Ligand binder design. Structure first.
Ligand SMILES: [Mg+2]
Ligand SMILES: [Mg+2]
Ligand SMILES: [Mg+2]
Ligand SMILES: [Mg+2]
Ligand SMILES: [Zn+2]
Ligand SMILES: [Zn+2]
Ligand SMILES: [Zn+2]
Ligand SMILES: [Zn+2]
Ligand SMILES: [Zn+2]
Ligand SMILES: [Zn+2]
Ligand SMILES: [Zn+2]
Ligand SMILES: [Zn+2]
Ligand SMILES: [Zn+2]
Ligand SMILES: [Zn+2]
Ligand SMILES: [Zn+2]
Ligand SMILES: [Zn+2]
Ligand SMILES: [Zn+2]
Ligand SMILES: [Zn+2]
Ligand SMILES: [Zn+2]
Ligand SMILES: [Zn+2]
Lengths: 440, 440, 440, 440
């Protein structure tokens, strides 16, 4: 699946619809980023700029100009073509091919932006700009507006109103179109295949990073070159660290391993967590914690639908958690009192769900305490976990256990669709998968 | 292989030996780097800071203070320990464990650096600082020196002399110790195994990125998690682009594929290029160009030794190249005149050799035109190539061919040691390797 | 005359009337300014901040908050009281006395602004801020808005709209109240007395700066400590330099002297130019040029009224000028053609009139080519001049003559009131004044 | 008196003598400074730049290049000539006239500095630059050095050592030449005449600012256009504020007035304080405090000579002060104990003496607690004072009295020369001067 030319056009038009007449919106590309000395990290476009263009070059600026309710045009600033720079660092779109390729009306050289941008903003009333997003962008925008402010004898006037478009654009990104959902559906499948493979390859004596290598190879073979975030492979006590990315330890028979990993496919993030026994067989103590986390996930998957909220489903998870932990003797007391005291928090100290899309922790307003009423088209994670510290004052057998189980869902008219259920999470199914792999 | 505690200590002492008495050297860690929104790229330490510490955290500063020829001490600023921040983002060394772990005399909280650094610089005559390396470092250093300048009524004085330590430190990095050479030797082996595997896996109809995935998986399985630079897989005309990293094309029977890829192992870069037929059999036209590049490499490997230079060996390569191209009718005229006119430059437009180490394009002075006399301990690449443009005015059969062949070497007392010869480059050996793999 | 507490209150309310509901306006004080090393220039408050407060301290910020059409409040950030800092550098208002003294609702310590400002902006929709006016102000404002943007988990939201209040506030300043006109009337009288005195004191052999000293002493004795701009005393060829402030030459019998000087009285600028003979008697050649400039001024004073514009009156002046210069043989040809060719421009190369108020070149929109229709309450200068270069190709007797004559006026219901007519400008009256003084 | 072409040349040569071979010193002009909107304060050149040039324009840079012990040259960057900009804002030296006018070898356009400065620094070992003095200068210098650092393929190298020249140059400025002393001698005379005049003009009912006007007029008439610092006229309780510059109060019969005022003559500061009765007759209580301050001054004038220090003379003043105050009942106890407890500090809370020159509080190292041994050529103030707060718990008659008496001196071979003794300070002489004036 991919995003069409037409879809990028629709998105620009939907932004322009919300803009005041006599205004321009300025959306800037991500800068290139040094890794060390003269080597740079693989380029990652700004998600908002990508959303409106599908254009993967730096030194580019999308300018959407609204004259009135039925009249608007698009201008792209981008890198000029250059035989020498392209023989070295790779091909460029340039100005000639850009209108047709990216569906914009006009394309100018980014090297001329300081000579041209103020002319495009002259006489407008409003400019939409994400101030503080990038320092280079602020320099360009402030420089244009100062030229206009100070150029009254050349009959120039600056727009007096500046509006942050991030609220508007993030509210758009919060609701996925059918095309976006198809892409995320494939991201979830790719990510699932990677997690299945990690379970199948895991053996005692392999290092945490070996499973990372299997996962990344699987992403790559389906055309997802990069992960959406740095892969987490926390075996044993490392599973109690939420963003453990060192992945440097030998995996030991008897330990669990927690894998949080997700691909980036056409810009969109997969995001799955599976926790499983390194030796393919859960112990009793491991099952006892795992079952609480799994019931939490399974109950949440049943509950999530239009009209509820992350907050409301999180309350059900807290209840399941506090009850399970009391039954194991990890918590002591009255369930309802422990719930009122938030007694689960030493063991489950993060949110159940985040928005998912072009960023793994996606944009969009959550409402106070994530109380926003869910509607169809919202995409989110469901990721309960329990993390018992090596030195928690609890029965010995539960100490140093970290378990998270995470699926990615889209809210539908009647409930939700699970994008990541093609990798197993029921303990008996995990064990059968690993046994089958160890034969073959 | 690894770098010892003792070696990091030796390096600090070697820097201190060159410092003026009554001085302090300030070496800052790399900042963390955003990939998108709240997600960050995998952390890569500043190579110079790494060189003196082997410490892989941000928000850290090494301060080496020389009182006199026999008296000096080391101070580390680093992140304080924090239970909440470590449960989330992973473990920290802290101040208690640092002296023993990293062999420094004292360790302070990076959060206190503005309160402490000026006190360490007070009364000194010289400060060694890499001005403009990082903006956060300059803010910290300039702020310390202003406090001292303006604090004469508190009996404070700033050092009046500031010296860039990069020349000194890069000159040290230019000459590798036995330990560094052992590490680079393993980086070369790992990188070679990856390239061998790419040749063995290549089939028509696979995408360029599939070979990238094989290479990265192989790096990872030997404990080199990351590449030293973004992998290049240029098949067909893409091989004429020097840093082609899109790797997005279907590999076609009849084309060559150029792979430039290198692992990062204990901080040190491997860097190999192999070019080979996608279908496992070089055509006549492909052999004709390949043989010129291979003779260039093989002649260079014979010539490189103490007392010659990159410039001098490059002259021999130009001669081989111009002669080969004249014999094919790609160039026309007298060889010596064509050489004098640099007629090879449309086809070979980059340097033959760069320094190699903690950075793939490593630090160290080259001398004018890379004329510096080579000495034992220098590590460098040998990477001749020929790139015939799709639209070059040459016989049709050579158009759109890009071939580079690259090995990594260390200069020894009598010649050089080749770190990357365990992956084949002779055409008959390449073909046999691919045939054997295709059976299986 | 002075500006009342009530007037400052009215102005704030008039700004608040124009503000959107759910908004705050931020008006910052001028920074202190170094003259050399640790000595500073006499403090000059930002004119806009002064306009709303009459408060003459740095490190102060006026915050006007509009909840709705009938509900708003004012917050002042200002310097805390400090016995040591006040014994040294002088008295401070502080927070206790400020509400009553300056008519604001609340006053907080400027040292706490970063801890408090974001709390005042939280939940608002709009912030009025003059971006780029002062760098310290932008740092404070951007820092507040970033706290709000990134603080959604603390239930903070930033206003998405930022509006430049300078257009609104400058449009207010463009129309003077009766109180402001009374103050400017006194500024014009003070400035006139100074110019009268300079004419009375002028003798051949005195230096240009001596007349500057007389003028400044006269400003000071009426309670106008500072000039509104750097005083111009251009004798001879120095009169051809528009902002000649060197004032370093011996004044010579036979030369004219051009004095452009104005006091600052309760913040408001006087601005007068008189040109006169150093020896008290105009030559024929001097009269011939002077009469053109004087007719230009006198005709303009008759014409200026509601309904005309600076542009329209400037056209009449150009006609007078071109005609006078043709009659002297300084220009040659048809008057109407010379007018169409703007043939006056080598001799009169500046505007006839600028707005006058808290700044000598005051704020307010002029319209294209200063075409804005004049209305009652506008205050402006009328300053025709003719400047014949030392090397102009004109009859010898006119070379090196610079003459400007300038009065300050306020537009009334039926015409204008001249604020500066108490210093003579008719040549016979100038000569009589100087003769009388020489006896003284 | 003035400073000769030859003297400016000597100073540059004296700096070059101390510079390392293969180095360049960069001395930047002061930026222009806004007073309000488009009006600027009178230009004040950077004192160090002035010291080496006597050049009073902005956008200028002196570059002194030392090749070796007998070979060096000077380059000036300055504003190009421009007919339009000079007709408006006044005459410019330009490049043609500068070598001869300012005694430099070469002069280039400041508009070309970024294209030329790096070429002048290329291949040098050391650059002398006052980092953090001006932000525009740092931008220019850092930009030049980055070009050199990164331009090794164009055979460019940056100097690795940067040295602050301020210590060296301020140490030079600390010792005045005969020419400088002659200029300061005239500054002291001018300043004295101004103070004499203020005493002669003072009447009850005049405002503090009226005496400021008399003083400034007197500075101006002797060719000192500007004061060296903002004039202090503190009558009554205002005399207890050390830098009282409001000068806004009606002077009352019965009060003292403290005037601290100094001219700037050819760049050099006068700096005198005289305190006197507004009505021309000291009361008993006023005499009692005045006599302590006067004895302090007179004893200091006797003591100051080569071989003592400000610290040592300050100890004698403290003794005189504590003894006088004990005798009046302002302090109670044993003199030697009160001295040991620094019991004078509520009443005398500033230093006795500061260096004087191109800045009123001049550059130069004081040593710890101003303990530096005085040598011939040092110029300094002697300014004891006693300030009894309105609410000090002392006998009523001394409350609200501020008295300072200040003279400017130069250390000679055998003692000191008093530059400001031509204005009276003995109380009987003050009273006679005022009585004589009142007749005017
Ligand atoms: Mg256990
Ligand atoms: Mg072909
Ligand atoms: Mg003449
Ligand atoms: Mg009294
Ligand atoms: Zn249109
Ligand atoms: Zn965004
Ligand atoms: Zn996850
Ligand atoms: Zn997640
Ligand atoms: Zn020691
Ligand atoms: Zn470096
Ligand atoms: Zn390579
Ligand atoms: Zn290489
Ligand atoms: Zn209210
Ligand atoms: Zn303004
Ligand atoms: Zn004027
Ligand atoms: Zn004017
Ligand atoms: Zn020379
Ligand atoms: Zn200085
Ligand atoms: Zn003084
Ligand atoms: Zn003083």
């Amino acid at each position: 699946s991919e995003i069409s030319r037409q879809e990028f056009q629709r998105r620009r038009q939907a932004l322009v619809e919300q803009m005041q007449p006599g205004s321009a919106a300025l959306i800037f590309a991500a800068p290139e980023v040094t890794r060390s000395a003269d080597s740079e990290y693989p380029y990652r476009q700004n998600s908002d700029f990508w959303y409106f263009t599908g254009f993967n070059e730096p030194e580019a600026v999308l300018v959407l100009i609204k004259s009135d309710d039925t009249h608007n045009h698009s201008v792209l600033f981008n890198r000029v073509r250059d035989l020498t720079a392209e023989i070295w660092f790779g091909r460029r779109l340039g100005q000639d091919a850009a209108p047709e390729k990216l569906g914009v009306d006009r394309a100018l050289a980014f090297s001329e932006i300081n000579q041209q941008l103020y002319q495009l903003l002259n006489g407008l009333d409003v400019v939409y700009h994400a101030q503080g997003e990038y320092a280079y962008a602020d320099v360009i925008v402030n420089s244009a507006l100062e030229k206009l402010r100070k150029g009254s004898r050349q009959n120039l006037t600056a727009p007096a109103t500046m509006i942050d478009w991030r609220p508007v654009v993030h509210e758009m990104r919060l609701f996925k179109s059918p095309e976006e959902i198809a892409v995320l559906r494939r991201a979830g499948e790719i990510t699932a295949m990677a997690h299945t493979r990690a379970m199948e390859k895991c053996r005692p004596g392999m290092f945490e990073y070996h499973l990372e290598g299997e996962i990344h190879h699987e992403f790559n073979r389906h055309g997802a070159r990069y992960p959406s975030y740095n892969t987490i492979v926390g075996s044993g006590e490392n599973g109690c660290i939420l963003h453990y990315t060192e992945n440097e330890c030998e995996m030991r028979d008897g330990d669990l391993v927690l894998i949080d990993a997700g691909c980036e496919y056409k810009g969109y993030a997969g995001d799955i967590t599976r926790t499983f026994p390194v030796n393919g067989k859960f112990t009793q103590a491991q099952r006892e914690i795992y079952d609480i986390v799994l019931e939490s996930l399974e109950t949440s998957l049943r509950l999530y639908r239009p009209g509820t909220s992350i907050l409301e489903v999180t309350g059900e998870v807290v209840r399941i958690m506090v009850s399970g932990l009391v039954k194991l003797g990890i918590l002591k007391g009255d369930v309802d009192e422990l719930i009122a005291q938030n007694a689960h928090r030493p063991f489950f100290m993060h949110g159940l769900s985040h928005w998912l899309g072009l960023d793994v922790h996606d944009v969009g307003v959550y409402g106070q305490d994530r109380s926003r009423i869910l509607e169809p088209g919202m995409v989110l994670t469901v990721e309960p976990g329990l993390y018992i510290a090596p030195d928690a004052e609890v029965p010995e057998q539960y100490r140093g256990i970290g378990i998270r189980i995470e699926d990615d869902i889209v809210i539908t008219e009647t409930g939700n669709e699970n994008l990541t259920a093609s990798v197993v999470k029921k303990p008996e199914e995990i064990e059968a998968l690993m046994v089958a792999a160890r034969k073959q």
